[PDB]
A paper describes a structure:
[name], also designated FcϵRII and CLEC4J, is a cell-surface receptor for the Fc domain of IgE, which regulates IgE synthesis. The extracellular portion of [name] consists of a C-terminal C-type lectin-like domain attached to the membrane by an extended neck region. The results reported here demonstrate that [name] from both cows and mice does bind to sugars in a Ca2+-dependent manner but that this activity has been lost in most primate species, including humans. The structure of cow [name] confirms the presence of the four disulfide bonds predicted from the alignment with other C-type CRDs and also shows that there are two bound Ca2+, representing the conserved Ca2+ found at sugar-binding sites in C-type CRDs and the adjacent accessory site.
Numbering used by the authors: 162 to 290
The structure:
Amino acid sequence: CNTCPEAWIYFQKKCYYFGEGAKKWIQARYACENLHGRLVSIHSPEEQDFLTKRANWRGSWIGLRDLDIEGEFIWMDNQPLDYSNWQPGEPNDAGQGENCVMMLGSGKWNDAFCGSELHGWVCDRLATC
Ligand SMILES: CC(=O)N[C@H]1[C@H](O[C@H]2[C@@H](O)[C@H](O)[C@@H](CO)O[C@@H]2O)O[C@H](CO)[C@@H](O)[C@@H]1O
Ligand SMILES: [Ca+2]
Ligand SMILES: [Ca+2]
């Protein structure tokens, strides 16, 4: 039906917001909430393909994190871990600990320090049709 709030993009019964501007993961979380969505949750290769094609080449935050329990990733939509697109070797919990997930410019996922500033962040919301 291709029906979304203004500035959002429709794909398979969800609307997506391709946010831009440097944000830490928590700032991106609340930026999405301010727009009445959440950082994006990804549950199929077709959805990943939609995002990969449109992703910010400098990287972008998504709605996946292991902040609560290390190695237990949780989606913003709280749905199961039924699809992954990890960059090879990721998540690697590098450095002091990497608990927030980004898409690299390629769309592949990397865990990163939650306080890194990325210039992209993607929100989603349920579409009305
Ligand atoms: C290559 C890459 O993923 N670069 C991003 C960087 O990633 C960290 C770390 O998380 C990766 O596991 C290793 C893989 O070699 O590389 C870097 O050390 O995280 C940054 C955010 O903190 C991103 O801006 C980079 O794109
Ligand atoms: Ca971690
Ligand atoms: Ca990593």
